[PDB]
């Protein structure tokens with residue numbers, strides 16, 4: 001009887017853990033992707049201000065297993081939204097403003 | 100004059116030891 | 131003959147000196163290798179701890195955001 | 202032309218090093234030995 | 242034999258990685274010097290143009 | 295476990311080997327390109343500078 | 348119980364990898380933003396000594412832009428100050 | 430708050446022989462180590478009222494170490510810290526750094542580390558040496574490099590003796606000093622500079638003695654060390670510690686070579702007659718004849734000065750005296766810093782050594798100043814080294830003992846660079 005009731009409890013716990021873990025992972029990914037979207041919005045605003053005020057002359061916004069490749073693509077996109085071009089521009093510009 | 104033969108053996112192992120000690124110095128630096 | 135034997139004695143003392151130098155260097159090298167592997171183990175443990183802290187961190191951030199939404 | 206005359210120079214165009222050189226020499230020697238052994 | 246291979250591969254990888262680190266840092270500094278020089282010469286050209294105007 | 299370690303370490307060894315070779319080639323080309331490239335931007339502004347002159 | 352442990356371990360590992368990669372990306376982005384805000388602060392402080400002349404005309408009296416000729420108006424302003 | 434004390438070579442351990450007598454007299458510890466909080470910096474307590482110093486004395490020649498092993502202070506020290514080599518470095522940088530230097534440094538360091546472990550809170554190292562010889566210069570350079578590699582962030586104070594401009598004992602001390610600056614500049618963090626001839630003249634002028642032995646020099650340098658460390662132990666109105674020294678007296682990373690002065694360095698018969706109030710001891714601490722180094726501050730400018738007042742001092746007369754010093758004309762501060770002073774006061778009056786030369790004075794002042802008046806010393810040493818290096822003289826000894834040429838090339842160019850750095854930071 002002990003092992004039978006233990007089996008039933010194990011099944012119920014299995015279901016509960018499945019639901020809880022899936023929900024938690026989904027929710028945390030959603031929250032943190034919203035956070036990084038806010039950060040990249042801030043970066044875009046900074047880039048626009050820098051160009052239009054100092055030296056842009058023109059500023060243009062960008063456009064916009066399986067889960068693993070999806071997430072890798074997402075992070076790569078959101079970190080490559082701003083290019084080495086712009087990073088070097090910012091560094092040299094900072095030095096020039098200093099002098 | 101087998102003294103000279105044993106001396107020559109000492110000289111050869113001396114050269115080998117020099118090379119090995121150079122190796123160990125580089126080893127220590129990188130470690 | 132005496133010249134050759136003096137050369138032999140000089141070779142013997144030089145060999146002993148070089149052997150002592152080699153022994154000291156290799157013993158120190160062994161100690162360095164032991165130190166390096168143990169500190170690498172420590173660094174790996176630190177990496178694991180940092181990852182666990184990050185997971186706890188975003189858990190706490192999730193809780194904060196949920197309570198903020200309720201407010 | 203007077204302002205043009207003024208300032209033409211701007212108009213026109215260790216131990217740490219020794220230690221780093223020592224370390225690079227040692228590591229280069231080790232690489233020499235390493236590829237020597239790898240080749241033979 | 243496999244353990245011996247582990248030791249050898251680990252050591253040679255470490256030394257190669259150290260060489261990579263050194264070359265990367267000083268290639269970075271050389272690139273920075275090149276960038277500074279090109280910006281400086283363009284500044285000089287612009288100043289010459291302003292004087293000409 | 296030994297064979298997986300061999301395979302992973304060999305792959306890392308080779309990949310870092312090509313990366314080291316390519317960064318060394320970048321060094322070699324940059325050293326030559328340094329002097330030549332500086333004059334190029336001067337000729338880029340050279341046309342307008344000569345027109346003003 | 349084996350199924351239990353395997354599933355829970357898989358979830359833990361995926362959470363680990365997500366958190367680590369995301370943290371690295373955020374650190375890089377925050378570094379970029381800090382550089383940008385330092386640049387803006389330097390610009391703000393520098394424009395205090397500018398006269399109203401260059402406060403209202405800092406540039407002079409349509410394809411993409413290359414990095415070499417990327418700062419020409421700023422160099423114009425620099426030359427005016429010189 | 431504790432600080433470790435290491436003494437390398439004849440001069441360093443001889444100075445320490447008076448430093449520890451002065452310390453025991455200050456803290457009331459009997460020579461055997463008994464007293465019938467304030468000492469924790471210099472001593473560690475144990476037993477039934479027993480205290481032992483936080484010092485090591487290491488030297489190659491055991492002839493002098495036996496003197497401290499037998500002379501009335503045997504019970505004071507731990508009978509392991511008294512390191513003894515086998516034979517002197519013979520004024521040879523290579524013999525003290527490469528030949529014999531590699532054999533005693535292990536036993537020295539494995540003892541320094543355990544003393545540091547015993548120490549509750551580490552706050553600094555202080556190293557006594559003279560660059561006038563091999564045993565001091567080479568071995569101290571090696572050990573200082575080893576400590577910089579091991580600990581690194583902890584402060585180091587080298588109380589270093591240069592050779593006098595003309596009153597010189599050794600013949601190879603130009604070589605040795607030029608080869609020891611390569612560490613004394615790059616590895617230590619604060620250099621407190623001495624010179625024998627300056628103390629000779631100081632005690633000839635004020636202490637009215639014409640034939641001063643080394644005892645007088647050691648005593649009036651131990652007094653400076655005690656006045657330096659008094660702020661760590663005793664209570665004061667404006668206590669100033671080692672990190673204060675570092676942050677206030679080192680404007681640039683490679684400019685740390687500071688002079689020193691003490692006043693009143695007075696006899697026992699002038700003490701009653703001549704008055705030693707603050708407003709005049711401060712002035713008496715600024716004349717070029719009261720500098721413990723044979724240098725002329727009028728030939729340069731003062732970067733930053735620091736004053737320590739032991740004894741009965743009220744913090745307003747110091748302000749008045751500093752105002753007078755600034756309004757004076759014979760001295761001229763570097764135009765960089767308006768606030769060029771680092772005041773500090775204590776409460777324990779100067780501690781007389783019975784049978785000594787100084788007197789029971791109510792108060793005293795120790796001044797340490799960083800100024801451009803030392804490029805002259807560096808230049809004179811460089812010149813008197815280059816001239817002997819011209820004919821390739823005395824160099825075969827170093828060549829056979831381990832040096833080849835690069836040591837001399839890099840030391841020469843390094844000293845040139847240091848002199849140029851002082852020149853360019855001057856104006």
Ligand SMILES: Nc1nc2c(ncn2[C@@H]2O[C@H](COP(=O)(O)OP(=O)(O)OP(=O)(O)O)[C@@H](O)[C@H]2O)c(=O)[nH]1
Nearest residue numbers: 438439440443520559561562563564565598643646
């Ligand atoms: N202040 C002070 N300096 C000393 C004393 N004794 C020696 N010196 C200095 O030390 C220099 C030569 O002594 P050292 O080189 O230190 O002798 P050492 O410590 O045994 O080192 P080596 O001579 O190389 O063996 C001289 O130029 C002196 O200036 C001393 O008792 N007091």
Ligand SMILES: [Mg+2]
Nearest residue numbers: 439490517564
């Ligand atoms: Mg000696």
